[PDB]
Symmetry: C2
Subunit: 428 residues, 2 copies
């Protein structure tokens, strides 16, 4: 019936002098959460969405359905929405990068094995007597099948799978200390439950005996885990749409030195542990690899079909539902390990986590003011954890002050990064 449904819709399109595009998304997911060791919550669900979009004289009309029925009613509904107020569809015939986004191994696990992974993460997080509790362990896996096809010959399909295991531990102290760790994986074999729980505990324990420090300007070694979150505020800035709308602090900066020469940031279609990796965007445009910053120089914005057509450039393959975005946004590593970065910094702050991005990070101005966790370093060694600190600045100035980049690359949902050394940052 997907073929039949497609066929009926394409025949209707031709009959009515419009183009039609059909986007199909089918997902299967399993998740579970332990709360202080007890399995308190899980989901096992399958989902299915079909979007029907009709294009006439550059205007679109769109109807979304979770049922593959009544194509003519669906079509007539989309057609009627053409009046709700330029646009175009992507044609068939392009080449797409081949990528191993679907492995098929998470699907083979029994639910007992998934539970046993989560319980093992809990057990490792709980082992040390200094851990007072383990408020959360979370497991998730997902399989997703995407199809986009239209009357201009587009016909593309991709499947992706992957999973995530996360643990958070609390260590005993004057103020309780929290720690967490996660791994993203394409296959279950790449999740190490025991190591994940052990790291969450190590994280928490290392903050025991934290002290606050005087407000001031310090050199900051921002660990990968903090930078992976912070980098997300760069994503709206590099949308060509946000630039056009006067909602980006990068307008007029193409070709300028926005970052330190040490800093290159790429949009990558694929990374083995980047679970958003995909060969095409939601307009069916092949995803592309490129520098956004190349040795600190801003090379391009990211586009959808509308902004590319408007700005006279080639589509870049970044037109996703919800906004123009990178697939994997990666800060390119340099050659120093974390330990080498500590040594080079010699005296300063290490920031390992940031919190409150939603309230605290302004992508229009670049300004941020964020609660943070970290350590004091003297003589190239962590001396003690740092309590109750806030960091603030402008993300673009941060980019300017990255003087050294590590080789300890970590992957998150949409960002990938090593640790960096920032010349100086405002700490409160």
């Amino acid at each position: 019936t997907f073929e039949e449904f497609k066929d009926r819709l394409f025949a209707l399109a031709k009959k009515n002098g419009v183009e039609v595009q059909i986007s199909f998304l089918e997902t299967r997911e399993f998740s579970l959460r332990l709360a202080n060791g007890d399995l308190d919550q899980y989901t096992d669900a399958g989902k299915f969405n079909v979007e029907i979009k009709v294009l006439k004289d550059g205007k679109t009309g769109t109807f979304r359905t979770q049922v593959l029925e009544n194509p003519e009613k669906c079509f007539e509904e989309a057609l009627s929405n053409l009046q709700v107020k330029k646009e175009y569809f992507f044609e068939g015939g392009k080449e797409y990068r081949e990528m191993e986004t679907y492995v098929g191994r998470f699907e083979k696990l029994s639910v007992k094995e998934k539970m046993d992974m989560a319980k093992k993460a809990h057990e490792s997080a709980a082992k040390d007597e200094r851990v007072v509790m383990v408020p959360t362990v979370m497991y998730k896996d997902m399989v997703i099948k995407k199809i986009i096809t239209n009357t201009l010959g587009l016909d593309v399909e991709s499947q992706m799978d992957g999973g995530f295991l996360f643990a958070m531990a609390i260590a005993r102290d004057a103020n309780p200390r929290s720690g967490s760790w996660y791994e993203l994986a394409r296959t279950p074999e790449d999740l190490n439950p025991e190591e994940i729980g052990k790291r969450a505990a190590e994280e928490a324990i290392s903050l025991i005996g934290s002290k606050t420090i005087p407000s001031g300007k310090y050199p900051v070694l921002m660990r990968n885990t903090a930078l992976l979150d912070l980098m997300e505020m760069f994503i709206p800035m590099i949308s060509a749409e946000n630039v056009q709308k006067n909602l980006s602090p990068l307008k007029g900066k193409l070709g300028e030195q926005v970052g330190n020469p040490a800093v290159s940031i790429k949009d990558l279609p694929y990374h083995p542990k980047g679970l958003s990796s995909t060969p095409f965007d939601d307009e069916g445009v092949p995803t592309t690899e490129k520098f956004v910053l190349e040795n600190g120089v801003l090379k391009t914005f990211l586009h959808n079909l509308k902004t590319a057509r408007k700005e006279g450039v080639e589509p870049t393959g970044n037109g996703f539902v919800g906004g123009i975005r990178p697939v994997n946004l990666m800060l390119m590593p340099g050659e120093k390990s974390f330990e080498e970065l500590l040594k080079e910094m010699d005296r300063g702050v290490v920031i390992t986590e940031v919190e409150g991005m939603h309230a605290g990070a302004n992508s229009i101005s670049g300004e941020f003011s964020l609660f943070a966790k970290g350590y004091w370093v003297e003589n190239g060694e962590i001396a003690h954890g740092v309590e109750d600190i806030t960091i603030s600045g402008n993300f673009l100035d941060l980019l300017r002050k990255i003087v050294l980049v590590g080789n300890d690359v970590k992957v998150s949902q949409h960002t990938i990064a090593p640790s960096v050394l920032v010349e100086v940052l405002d700490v409160a």
Copy 2:
């Protein structure tokens, strides 16, 4: 195929000596938003979900699907989930309140008619020359059908529809002044777009010439619109689950005078404009009418099947997905108009809106610290808007301090309230 799906599931349940429950949710929604008069976003979407839950020896196994096929495999999947972490289904045979939740008129409207409603609200909001712009107008309508059935004898069905229209305007001043208004209704004939637009503009225009006032303790006439929002923080407090888990400041307070004797708050299964109104909860339990507070005295918590069994009380019909909640939480009116309340207060502050509940309202402690909009009142008359006002306090202390309740009842999504006079509140 729902009846065929059900019959096959039920037969498998019998064959395996387990119980099975099926919950069906089917929705259609249409929404639109104008951004400064330009219709720049809309949704037209149908959704469908079925949840299959199997019960064996007080354990449940759940599987959710957005496709009615392969009941045998859905059953097996739910059954395999019994391993993952007491429990009971609601049985057949109880009586439900009959209520007019589905009218069927929104669905008869054309897309152009819906578009014309939102445009008339915008025109009406933009008409006065003091309005700089009308940043948002939003229209939404929805129809929902719910079925819950199980092998104990439960078989219940309900349909609900309704709609919303909202406008926000900005008025010219040294600092721009914002105002807004919405109406919720079960039929479009009860939405008045010209009035909603005009009221948004009036709200903004009335704040022109707003002035600062000295921080301190003032009498506060809290207008229905502000109270409707504030009251939402009471909802987690009255959940029996939150009470048991030490996440409510009401633990141990049953039978105590939590509120002023002037304050009665009911949970009501139905209000004509209460769009969440429903004869049964997500467990199939009939919804019930009861005092939560009666003349200030805390009479009961709200329950789901689990909490009710645990406490040995009858289920109340408040077991909803996402937490125990009232259907329509209503502060019962007194006899005084808004104008009469102003005259009684004589001198003090009117609060018309509060902002920032998410991060500013703590339903565990009851503490709130919120941005607000309002006016200064002298000699029983509004004098001028009050600029940059924050209000703070404890929601329970506010309930104690409500000395007079108005008769100007307005409905929100889950709360229904008139305006109230609060003896004293902290204003900054």
